[PDB]
C-alpha cells in the first residue's frame, strides 16, 4: 500500500490537513493507511475515517443520481436514441462508488470490527457497515440486491441492539445510527411505517433524557434530534 512507508501519526496529521483543505480523497487515503497500521482507532481517529469516506462517497452518490436520472429520461417513450454513452458513464461512476464501499467494508472486516470491544467503537463501526451496504443497495439492481439489503439490515440491527443496551438514548452515535436505520427502512426496505416509528421513538426517548446532560452534550444531542424531526415532517 502506498501509505505503508509513512508513520501512523504523520498519516493522522495529514488527514487533518486534507480535511482543512477539503481534499477528501486524500483524507480517505491517509486514514486507510492509518487503519492498515493495525492498531485500534481512537474516537477522534474513527471520526476522521468516517468524515473522509462519507464525503468521497457522498460526491459519487450525488453524481450517480444525476446520471441515473438522465438515463431514466433517455429510456422514456419518444426520447431520441443517443447511444450507449449515458449508461456507460453511469456504470463508470457506479463502479467507482462500489469500489469505495468495498474498500470501507474491507477495512471494517480486516480488522476494525473484530478488535472493537467497547460499545462506542463497536456501534460506530457496525453503523458504518450498515451505511456502506446501504450505499451499495442504492445502486443494486441484480440478483444480489436482496442479500445486500439484508447485510445492511443485519449490521444496523446488531448496532441497535448494542446501543440500546450500552448507551444512553441521547448518545449522538446512537441517535445517528437510529436516524440512518430509519432512512434505510424508508427508502431501501420499503418500510416507511417502520421508518416513522423508529424516528419518533428515538426522538421521544432522547427528549426524556436531555435533562441529564451538560450544555455541550445537550447541543450535540438536540442537533441530531432536529434531523429526526425534519425527516418526520417530510414523511408525515
Amino acid at each position: 500500500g502506498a501509505m505503508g512507508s509513512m508513520e501512523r501519526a504523520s498519516l493522522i496529521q495529514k488527514a487533518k490537513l486534507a480535511e482543512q483543505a477539503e481534499r477528501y480523497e486524500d483524507m480517505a487515503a491517509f486514514m486507510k493507511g492509518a487503519v492498515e497500521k493495525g492498531e485500534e482507532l481512537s474516537c477522534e481517529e474513527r471520526n476522521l475515517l468516517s468524515v473522509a469516506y462519507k464525503n468521497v462517497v457522498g460526491g459519487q452518490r450525488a453524481a450517480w443520481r444525476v446520471l441515473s436520472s438522465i438515463e431514466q429520461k433517455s429510456n422514456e417513450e419518444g426520447s431520441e436514441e443517443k447511444g450507449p454513452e449515458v449508461r456507460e458513464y453511469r456504470e463508470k461512476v457506479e463502479t467507482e462508488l462500489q469500489g469505495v464501499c468495498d474498500t470501507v467494508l474491507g477495512l471494517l472486516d480486516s480488522h476494525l470490527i473484530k478488535e472493537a470491544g467497547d460499545a462506542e467503537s463497536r456501534v460506530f463501526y457496525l453503523k458504518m457497515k450498515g451505511d456502506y451496504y446501504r450505499y451499495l443497495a442504492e445502486v443494486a439492481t441484480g440478483d444480489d440486491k436482496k442479500r445486500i439489503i439484508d447485510s445492511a439490515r443485519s449490521a444496523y440491527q446488531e448496532a441497535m441492539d448494542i446501543s440500546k443496551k450500552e448507551m444512553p438514548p441521547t448518545n449522538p452515535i446512537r441517535l445517528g445510527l437510529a436516524l440512518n436505520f430509519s432512512v434505510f427502512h424508508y427508502e431501501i426496505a420499503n418500510s416507511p411505517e417502520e421508518a416513522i416509528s423508529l424516528a419518533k421513538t428515538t426522538f421521544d426517548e432522547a427528549m426524556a433524557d436531555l435533562h441529564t446532560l451538560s450544555e455541550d452534550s445537550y447541543k450535540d444531542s438536540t442537533l441530531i434530534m432536529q434531523l429526526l424531526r425534519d425527516n418526520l415532517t417530510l414523511w408525515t
Binding site: N47, V183, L234
Partner: peptide, 10 residues
C-alpha cells in the same frame, strides 16, 4: 428537500 441522514461529528 431531501431527507437527512446522519451528519459527521466533524
Amino acid at each position: 428537500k431531501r431527507r437527512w441522514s446522519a451528519p459527521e461529528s466533524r
